Amino acid sequence: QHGPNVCAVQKVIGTNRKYFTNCKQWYQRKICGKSTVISYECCPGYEKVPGEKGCPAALPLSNLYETLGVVGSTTTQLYTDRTEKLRPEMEGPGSFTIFAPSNEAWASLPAEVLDSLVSNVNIELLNALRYHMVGRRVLTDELKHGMTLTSMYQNSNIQIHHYPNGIVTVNCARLLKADHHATNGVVHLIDKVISTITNNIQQIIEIEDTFETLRAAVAASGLNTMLEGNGQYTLLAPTNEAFEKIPSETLNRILGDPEALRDLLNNHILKSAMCAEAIVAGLSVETLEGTTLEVGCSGDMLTINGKAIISNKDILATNGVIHYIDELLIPDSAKTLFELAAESDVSTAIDLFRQAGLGNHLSGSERLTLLAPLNSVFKDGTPPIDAHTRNLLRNHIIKDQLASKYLYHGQTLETLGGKKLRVFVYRNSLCIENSCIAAHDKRGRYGTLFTMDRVLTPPMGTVMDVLKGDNRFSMLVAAIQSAGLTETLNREGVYTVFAPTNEAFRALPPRERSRLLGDAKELANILKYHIGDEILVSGGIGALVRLKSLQGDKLEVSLKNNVVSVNKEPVAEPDIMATNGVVHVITNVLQPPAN
Secondary structure, three states: OOOOOEEEEEEEOOOOOEEEOOOOOOOOOEEOOEEEEEEEEEOOOEEOOOOOOOOOEEOOOOOHHHHHHHHOOHHHHHHHHHOOOHHHHHHOOOOEEEEEEOHHHHHOOOHHHHHHHHHOHHHHHHHHHHHOEEOOOOOHHHHOOOOOEEOOOOOOEEOEEEOOOOOEEEOOEEEEEEEEEEOOEEEEEEOOOOOOOOOOHHHHHHHOHHHHHHHHHHHHHOOHHHHHOOOOEEEEEEOHHHHHHOOHHHHHHHHHOHHHHHHHHHOOEEOOOOOHHHOOOOEEEEEOOOOEEEEEEEOOEEEEOOEOOEEEEEEEEOOEEEEEEOOOOOOOOOOOOOOOOOOOOOHHHHHHHHHOOOOHHHHOOOOEEEEEEOHHHHOOOOOOOOHHHHHHHHOOEEEOOOOHHHOOOOOEEEEOOOOEEEEEEOOOOEEEOOEEEOOOOEEOOOOEEEEEOOOOOOOOOOHHHHHHOOHHHHHHHHHHHHHOOHHHHHOOOOEEEEEEOHHHHHOOOHHHHHHHHHOOHHHHHHHHHOEEOOOOOHHHOOOEEEEEEOOOOEEEEEEOOOOEEEOOEEEEEEEEEEOOEEEEEEOOOOOOOOO
16 A cells, blocks of 8 residues: 555546645546546655655755755745845745745746836836745635635735635635645645736726627626626626627617616626636536526637637636637527427427417517427427417417416316417426426426426217227227226216227237126226326336226336336327327236235
8 A cells, every 4th residue: 555644646547737625535537538647746745755655754844945945846946035035034934825836827927918028027026026925824624614815925814715526726726736835834735827817807898909898798787896896706797798799689679678788797696706717627616696507628729618609717806716618608598489488399380380380489578387398209200380289389378377286186277269278287297188297397487387297188078088089999889888987987087997998808818808708796896997096197107106006006107218107008009188188099908916
C-alpha cells in the first residue's frame, strides 16, 4: 500500500488540469467529458525520503515569501521582488494569507492587462498582489463556510465560495493547493490572477453594449432593484444575438406580456452564485422561474442542457456571477401550446393537429389542455387526415388549462365539443380513459401539454354494445344471455371484462365444451370471473394487480413489455373503452382457482 502522508491527485488525461485532494476513497471516473488518472504525491508540509515509502519527513517552516517557491508560485514570487516593498513584508514578522496565482494564471493574462501591471511595479503590481493577501491566517475550514474576506488592499472584499463536490473558489479561481503553512502565514495556490469587484449585476448589464436588449427587458419587467440588491445570484445573461435568434412574433409577444417577460428573465437567474470551475459534471439547477436546467461542462466550455452556449465565463459582481449565454432560455410558461411542443418529443402529434385544421388551438391564447401522444406511438406511421382521425384529434383537446398531478378519482374532463372523458388515477399511474400521462406536464402561458403514452380511444356504447358489434363475441354474447348478465353489462358500472373470442370456446377440450354448455349455474360463475369490480386499463397495471372478480376470486393481471396478461394468459386487443367499463380481448377462457 501507499506510504505515510501521501495525498491523491486526480489528473485529467492529456491535460495540465489537476484536482488536489486529501487522498479520498471515492472518485469520479470522468471530469467534464474526459477520463482521469489518480496520481499520488506528498501532502502539504511533507517530503519523500530515499529508500523509504511515502513522504515521512516533515518540511521545515519557511517565511510566506519562501513558501511561494515551495508551492510552485515562482512568477508570483518574482513579481513580489519587483515591487521592492512586498518581499521584506512577506519575510518579516506577522500573520498573513496569500492566494498566490499559479505560473499558468499569469501566462493566461491578456497582453494589455499584464503590460499595465509590469510597467508600474510600485502602483499597479503592488496593489494587485496586495489584493491576493489577507492580514490574518485563513485556512480551508473557514474557506469551506463560503464567507467573504477582507484583503490587504483598501479593505476590498474577496469572494469565497464552497461547493458540495469539495471545490473552493477565490473570486471564481479554483483553489489548487491549500493550507501550506509558513513561519508568518499560510500560502494557497489559486487557478487565476484575481481582481477587485466594484459593480453589481445590474450595473454590469447597464455598462456592457452586448446587453442592450436584456437591459431594456429588465427595465420593462422592473427587476432593476432585484439585480441591484445584496445577494448571491447567477445570471445567464443573454446577448443581443440571443434575442435576435428568436422569431420577431414570439419575442414581441413575450416582451409585451408582463407574465411571459417576468418568466423569461427569471429563467436566466439562479438562486446561488456558481463559478465555472465548480462545474465538474452534470448538475440539475432550479431557476427563479422554476424550470430545471442541466448545467454541465465539455472540457473547458460550460454547457446548458448539453448545448455549448456559454460564450463568456465568470463575470464577477458584488451580488453574483454572470455567464454570457448565446441562446434565450424561454420557459414553457412563456411559450404557446405550439412553440413548446412543435420541436419536442410529441412533434408528430402537433403536426397531426395542424393538418386536421385544429392548429389555432395551439397558436392562440385559449385556455386548454392538449393530450399529445409521444412520437414513438407513430413509429409505424401516421393515420390519414379523414373523418375518424379528425374527430379523434378533436377529442384530444380539453376545455380549461389543467395540471395532471391535481386530477382526482371521479373527475370528468370536457373536450372541445361535448365528450366527457373519465380520469382513472392509480398508485403509480394516471390515465384519461385508455391514454396515460407518460411525461412531466408542459405548462404553457395559456395552455398545458399532457404528454401521453398512446392515442386516446373514447368509449362507444356499453360492454354489451361492444361485444354485440363484433362477430368474434357471438358465442360470448349467447353465453352472457344464458347466465343472465346482459342487463349487468348494459347498465352503468365500472367493469374490466376479459372477453374470450369464439376460438377461445372452440379451443376448450370436447369434454369442457359440452360440459360448459350443459350447466347454467356454473356457466354464470365462469363468466363472472372474467368481469372485474373496477376499471383497469393497460397503462394502470404497472407490475401486478390482483383484481377481484364478480365471481369472488382475484385475477392475476400483469404488464410485461407492453403486453397485458390475465392469469398468465396474453391479451390480443387491450383497452376497448365502453361507457360502463373496459374490454380486454383474450384468446383463452379463464378458470377460477377455487369452485
